[PDB]
Amino acid sequence: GSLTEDGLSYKEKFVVRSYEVGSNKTATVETIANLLQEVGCNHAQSVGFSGFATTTTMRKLHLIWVTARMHIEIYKYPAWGDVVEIETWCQSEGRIGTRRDWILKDSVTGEVTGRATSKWVMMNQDTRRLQKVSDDVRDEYLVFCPQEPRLAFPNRSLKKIPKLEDPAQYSMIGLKPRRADLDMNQHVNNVTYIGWVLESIPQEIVDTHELQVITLDYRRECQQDDVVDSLTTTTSDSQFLHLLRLSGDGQEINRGTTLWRKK
Amino acid sequence: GSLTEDGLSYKEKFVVRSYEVGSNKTATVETIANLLQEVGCNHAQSVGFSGFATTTTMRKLHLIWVTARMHIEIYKYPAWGDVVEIETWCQSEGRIGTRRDWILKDSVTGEVTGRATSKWVMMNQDTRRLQKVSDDVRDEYLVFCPQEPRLAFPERSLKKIPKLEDPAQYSMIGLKPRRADLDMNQHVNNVTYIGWVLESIPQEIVDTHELQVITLDYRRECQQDDVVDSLTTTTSDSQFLHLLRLSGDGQEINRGTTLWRKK
């Protein structure tokens, strides 16, 4: 992949692999999310970011970016062997945090097949205390980001998500991460949570519908030795409300919604 | 990737991705095994194989190949961003079954960084009854395979593995597959079992040693709604003996050995 001409966005092509596809022989939403993260990492590397994707001031102040929200809309999942092109870029959102956006295209047709957006907040790596973005970090972002707004979603991606009320309609309990679920820093990979959310969807919905939209808020991390319960209730196209919580004390780790279209 | 000049082997290049690496920023053994399976699938496609990698006679008789044994030796794990080249080929082993072999090379240096071999047996897809290879299937293999022997392991990969005796030294219990662990035909992916075996290795071994060799026998499949326990005992470099069994009735799924070298 490489930076675009203006140096303000990044593009990369991927061939969908055999083990990356589900029962209709197209990429799973987890494969898609992994690809989004890979192209994000390649972008950060190309513009001079560090394990973590920090800036110089951030390293000085022991700060990291963490994900607050991920929103993905897929119009067409690429088939096994197909080539997908992904374009990504970032923007600062003042003192609130930053945003990374993606567009997915079929590289044969050049048609948009999906779009995604994510919100990131600043966190002290040791205390794990959330903070506002300092003036000096905003200045570093400015040089690698478009100055005028550029939005993948010009709005479902901004909607408030409510907390599922007991009892849930469906559940999958006793979920735990294995080593393949961890990143190089031994944190649970953000895409694992997407998989866990989807585990409490009935196989029948999955057999008969395609996922069109997922929105996931990230409230707290699952540790390597934690155990998670995944809860879902129908709110309807079918729509669902989702909650991930620690199996023991019921501490919330994520909430989300999904929207599914009949095939 | 493509077939080599003679049409009797297949080569493919892969760039190691951000989410494919573990704590020392090199590819996990599970990433390696996934890449082995991907290049195997690309080879099969290129020589006219069909979901399943069946031949024409196999489909006619409702037969499939299943894995009986996987053996991997790694000398050097490729780093994040490195390019690895993998060469693969198959051979018939008379009426016993077939073999697929792989060689892994650094594409910058051309050095061999790893080797693998796998044994496959014929199975009736409906009855799940194992069978010998028929004369007409041997005939189909012969046109795509080298005629003279070509072994990734000329002269450990053939050693008999004993059954771990209770009590195990170490254990990880209540493992279950999620949708990301299933292949396009909804069977548990062969690489999942590797991950499950490794889960009962202590984190300290993993922190201080590199996995050099893994040998895994495949006795029976884990179904999508099964639960697995992973058992390990030190037999020693450190060596371990491994058993995967169904959590309930204790039915054996897999047995194996690993060999580890201090860093």
UniProtKB/Swiss-Prot annotation, chain B:
Keyword match rRNA processing: no
Any one GO molecular-function label of the UniProt entry: fatty acyl-[ACP] hydrolase activity
Listed EC numbers: 3.1.2.14
Domain of life: Eukaryota
Catalytic residue positions: 185, 187, 222
Catalytic activity: (9Z)-octadecenoyl-[ACP] + H2O = (9Z)-octadecenoate + holo-[ACP] + H(+)
Signal peptide (residue range): none
Chief location category: plastid
Family: Belongs to the acyl-ACP thioesterase family.
Name of the protein described by the UniProt record: Oleoyl-acyl carrier protein thioesterase 1, chloroplastic
UniProt source species: Arabidopsis thaliana
Gene it is expressed from: FATA
Shown part of the complete sequence: 75 to 359 of 362
